[PDB]
Subunit: 220 residues, 6 copies
C-alpha cells in the first residue's frame, strides 16, 4: 500500500528498524520461527514478508528473489518503510580447499561482477559490509561454536557460466551480495552478509539461520 | 526433474516448441485459460508453468520472475526443454507523453542497462527481437484494433535509480543515470522494464526466436492517473495479443 | 548551398522525404535509373546526389563514401533538407554456411564495432532498424522471388584486420550500418538496410538494387 | 592493380618514398603542380593520385577521402606501395579565439575521438606525429613568414556531434560530447578535424613517419566571418608549406 | 641488500612479521619510540626503516612515500622480507561536516581512484581491509577514549584534481572529477588520501593482512581552522592507537 | 609556506619560470652543480629543491619522488609558484635492439599506462611533449655529440609486473612521463622529457644531466 511491490505499510512494521533478507520464502518462515511473535504480513511475487520480535523489538524477514535486480527492489522498499539495517543469510559452495562443508562464511566485501551495483555507485567504490554487522555475525557464529572464515565473496549475475578469484583468496560465489553491500554502503544503511557452506569442489545450514537471528539481536 | 529450477521434465512439455513468458506467476493461469485444455504443470518459487493447446499444438506458459538473472534461468532451462520461440507479455509504464494508457508496445530492440546479457554477448551486440515474432505481435495487435507503438525499450537492472526515480529513501541517483531519462526520451525510447535485455540478447545470440509485447498501464509523464478497470482491461488485451501472435508462429 | 558538404538546397529536393544511400557514385546512377525522371543534382567529394520520382513522389539517391564518418555527414545533411527515411543497399560477403551467393540479407540490427555510432548514443543503445523499413525490404525481396535471410550484421571501421560472431548467428560484415542504424533510431528517423551476397568463405547484385527501389515505393 | 582500392602498381610510383596526402581529390592536381613533371596516375572513388618530382626524386600526391576508415585504406595501400613518409595537408577551423584565419597549424599529436585508430594501437598509445616531419613543417612555415601554432588537434569520427555542433536536425548531442568543446578549449586544443587520429596512430605504431599541417580558413569562436579570397590564399600557402616541408624530408 | 629499494636484509628484521607503515620518514622514529629497544635500520630515499620490540616480538616501522607506486614498492619488498601484517598510520582531512578535528578514522575499504591497485586485482575486486586489523584498530581507539568513525575512504592518485580542488594553477578539473566530491559525500565517504587503494588491494589479493587508521587534522567542509597544538596532539594519539593495535595482532 | 608540500614561497624562486624535475635528491644536487649560484632551498618528504642561475636567469631543480602521484604534486605546486616550463631527466632501460647503452632518448609522447594522467584528461588525449622543449633537448644532445633516438615511451605505475610495445616501436619504459606530459599539455604548461640508456635486454649518465641543463638554457 505504501510501496510499489512489497504490499506493506509503515504501520505493518510496528517500528521495525532491522530486516533479515534471504532469497527464498521457505527460508523466511524458518528464520521468523526462531523469533518471538512471528506473523506473516504479505506475499507478492518474489517478496514474502513476516514480522517478528527480538528482545521486545520488531524485526522483519523478507525474501529477495534471485539476483541484484529483485534484491534492489526489496531493500529500497524496506528502507522507505524505515529499515536501516539489513542482514543477508544464504547457502553456498566454497572455492578454497581449507573451507569445510558446515563452516560459516562472513563476507567483509564482494567482487562486483553484477550489473545492479553500478546503478548505485561506480565500479571503483567498494562493495563493503558494515563493521557493526560484520562484528555481530562473527560474534554470534563463535557463540554457537561455528567454524568461521571471514573474507571476500565473488558476486555475479549468472549461476552457471579463471581460477583468478581462488588465487586472490576469494572464499565463495553467489549472486546478491554485491548489489546489497554496495547499495547500503553508498546510501547510509548498514548491511551484513553470512553463509553456510553446503558444497566445496575441493573437499548444517540451520546454523547460519540461528547465527543471523542472534546477530540481529546484537544490532538492535 | 530434467532441469535444475523449474521442476519440469521434457515429456511434461508434450513436444511444445513455443513458450509465452510473463514475469508474474499470478498471470500464468489466465493466459493459459485463453487456450485449449489448460493444465498446471509445476510451481516452484516464481517459476509457475502451465501447458495448453493452440490449433492442436502444445504450448507452455512459464513465469520468469523479476530481473535478468531470474529470467536467464527460466529461458535457459526451457531452451534445454526444447522451447525455441519465446514471447514475452508484460504491463509497463511509458516514458513518452504521446503514448496513452491502454496503448500496446511491441519492442524491436532494447537498451542494455543490465548485467546478465553481458554473459551471453558483449555490449556491442544488439538486444534485438526476432523479425517473425515482432511481425506476429504487430499483426495480432492490429487485428484486435489496438493502438500500437513499435520501437526501442530501455531494460534496467533496477526499478529505481536505473529508471531515474528520485522519490526513494536516499533521493539520489548516481551520475551515470543523472539526466538519463531525458536522454532516452529524446532518443525515442518508449518505456522502461527489467527483463528484455537478457531475454532478447540470449535468444538472438543462440539461434532462438524472441519477441515482446506490453500493455501500457501508466505514464509517468502524464498528469492524469490511470482508471482502475482500464488497467485490468489493458492487461486482458495484451494477453489476447500474445496468444494470437503465438497462433501465427506455431 | 544550404548544407556544408552536399552542395544542395531544400528546393533541389522538390519535397523529397526519402533517400537511398549506397556507398559509391556508380551505384547511385544505377539506382536512379530504375526510377522515373532521374536527374543528377550534385557531386562534391564522396557525395554524388541524384533526384528521381516514384509514384509521383520525389526520392533522392546519394552516395555516402566509406565508413561511419562520411555516412554520418550525408545522413545529417539530408535530414536538414527534409529526409526522414533512409534505405541503405550494399554488397557483402556472408559468414554463415547456409547463406548462398545471390541471396539477399535484410539487417534487423548491427553489432556496433565502429567508432561513429558512439557519437550518437552510448554502447548500450541498440543499432536497430526501423520496423516499417525492415518489413518493406522483406516484402520487396519476396516480390521478385529473392532468397532472403533476416538478422544481425557486424559493422566495423576496418575492411581487413574470433569466430564468435558466427557462433552468435551474425550474417555478414560491413562498415556503415552501425552508424546509420544508431544515428537514425536515436534521432527520430527511419532507416533500413539490405545487401546482396557476392561472396561466402563457406560456399546477382542488380536484384538488391531493384529491391531497395521497390521497398522505397512502399514507404512513400 | 597491385593494391585493392587505389588502382596503382608499384612501378607507377617510380621508387617514390614520400607522399603528400590531402583529403579532397580536387586538391591533388594543384599541389602536384608546384612540383616538376606532374602526371595523373589514377583516379578511383576519392582516391586520386598524381606523381611528380622534387629535387630529382619521385613524390606521390594521393587523396584520402573523409574519415578514418577511408584514410586507413589509402595509407595502408600506399605503405604497401613503398611510401614511408606521409604529410597531411588540410584546411580547418580553429577552436581558440586567438587563432586567426590565415594562420597555419602544425599538429604535434591528436585527441583520439575516432574508431579506426583502435585497430592499430590501444587507446593508451598516443596519436603522435614524427619529429622530423613536424620540424620540417614548422621550418617551411617560418621560411614562408606564416603565423604558426604548434600543438594538439582533436580528431573526430563525426563532423557534427563529435565537434559539439547544435545547429543540426535533432539539436542534441549525446552526453559524452555535451560540454566537450569547452573542455578541449581549456586544454589548449587548437582545432577539430576527422582523419589525423588514424593517420598518426597507424604511422607511429608501424615504423612510418607522418606529420600534418593545415591552414585556418574559419573560426567558430570569432564573430567576424572569413573573406572570400583570404580562404583561397590560405589554401595556397598551406600547399606551399607542405611541398617545402617535403623537400627537407627526401 | 636482500631487496632492491629498502636496502634491508632478512636478518635485519629479526623475524618481525608485523610492520607499521607511515607515509613520511620523519614519523618513523617517533612511532618506534613508543616501543622497546628502537634501532635505526636503514634510510634510502623516502624508505626509512626502524626496528623495535613489543611484548618481546620484533616489529618494523617503515615509510611508504607518497602515492600508490611508491607504496607498492615498500609493501612488496617488506612482504619479501617476511612481513605479513601491515598497519597504515596517517593524518588526514575529512570530507564530512560531522567529523571533527581530533577524531580518528578506521577504514573498512577504499574507493579505488588510483592506478597501481589495478596491477594486483581488477577494478571489480574490493580494496578491503583485514577484519582482525580493523577490529584491533577500533578496539585500541576506544580503549584510548578516541572519537572514532569506521567506514569508506576515497584513495586518489592525485592531491589536487582527484580530490576536486579548484584553488590550483589552472582552476579546472576534468569532467570525471567534476562534482565528484559531492557524490562521495552523499555516499558516506569519510576522507581523501592517496595510498590505501594500493595497500589494501595488494594485501587482500595476496593473503596478507592490512588495516588503516588516521587522525583528523583538518576539515575542508568546516569554517573553523584547526589549532596548532591540537594537530600535533591528534598525531600522537593516532600513533598510540596503531602501536596498541599492533600489540593485539602479534 | 605558499604551497602544501614543497615548503617554498614565490620569493624563494626569484622570478624562475623553468624547473628541472628528476625523481631523486642525489640527482637534483648533481644538476644544480652544473649551473651558476646553486643554493638548496628546502627538503620536505620526496621534494628536495635547489635554486640556480643560467645566463643570469633563475632556474629551479626539484625532485619528484616515485610515480605519477608524487610527480603531480611537485609540478602543480611549482606552477602555483610561477613555473611554466618543466624538463624531466631520468635514466632507463631500452627495449629496442638498435638502442645502445650510452644513447640518449628524447620522448615525443608516452603510452598512458598510469593512473594519474586520467585525473587531468580522458584517455583519448595525447601524453605529448611540447615542441620547443623537444627541439631544445635534441639540439643540446647533438651539441655534445650524443647518439640520440626520438620517439614514444611507455609509462606505468609498476616497476616490475606483451612484446606489443616493442612491435609498436616504443623505445623504453618508465613511471613518470605519462602524468608529466599529460598534465602539462592539458593545462598550458610546456614539458620535455629526456633519458640516458643504462641497460638494454637486447644488447654515461652524466651526459643526460648536461643535456637537460643546456636544453633549459635554450628555453629561457
Amino acid at each position: 500500500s505504501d510501496v510499489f511491490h512489497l504490499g506493506l505499510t509503515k504501520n505493518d512494521l510496528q517500528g521495525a528498524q532491522l530486516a533479515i533478507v534471504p532469497g527464498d520464502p521457505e527460508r523466511v518462515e524458518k528464520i521468523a520461527a526462531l523469533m518471538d511473535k512471528p506473523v506473516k504480513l504479505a506475499s507478492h511475487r518474489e517478496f514474502t514478508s513476516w514480522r517478528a520480535e527480538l528482545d521486545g523489538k520488531a524485526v522483519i524477514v523478507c525474501s529477495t528473489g534471485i539476483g541484484g535486480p529483485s534484491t534492489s527492489i526489496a531493500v529500497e522498499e524496506l528502507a522507505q518503510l524505515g529499515i536501516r539495517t539489513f542482514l543477508r543469510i544464504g547457502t553456498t559452495g566454497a572455492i578454497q580447499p581449507h573451507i569445510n562443508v558446515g563452516d560459516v562464511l562472513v563476507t567483509t566485501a564482494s567482487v562486483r561482477l553484477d550489473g545492479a551495483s553500478l546503478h548505485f555507485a561506480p565500479m571503483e567504490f567498494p562493495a563493503v559490509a558494515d563493521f557493526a554487522c560484520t562484528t555481530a555475525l562473527v560474534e554470534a557464529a563463535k557463540s554457537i561454536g561455528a567454524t568461521t572464515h571471514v573474507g571476500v565473496t565473488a558476486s555475479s549475475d549468472t549461476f552457471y557460466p579463471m581460477e583468478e578469484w581462488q588465487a586472490m583468496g576469494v572464499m565463495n560465489y553467489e549472486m546478491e551480495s554485491a548489489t546489497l553491500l554496495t547499495m547500503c554502503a553508498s546510501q547510509g544503511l548498514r548491511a551484513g552478509m553470512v553463509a553456510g557452506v553446503i558444497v566445496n569442489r575441493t573437499q548444517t545450514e540451520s546454523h547460519a539461520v540461528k547465527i543471523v537471528v542472534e546477530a540481529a539481536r546484537r544490532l538492535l
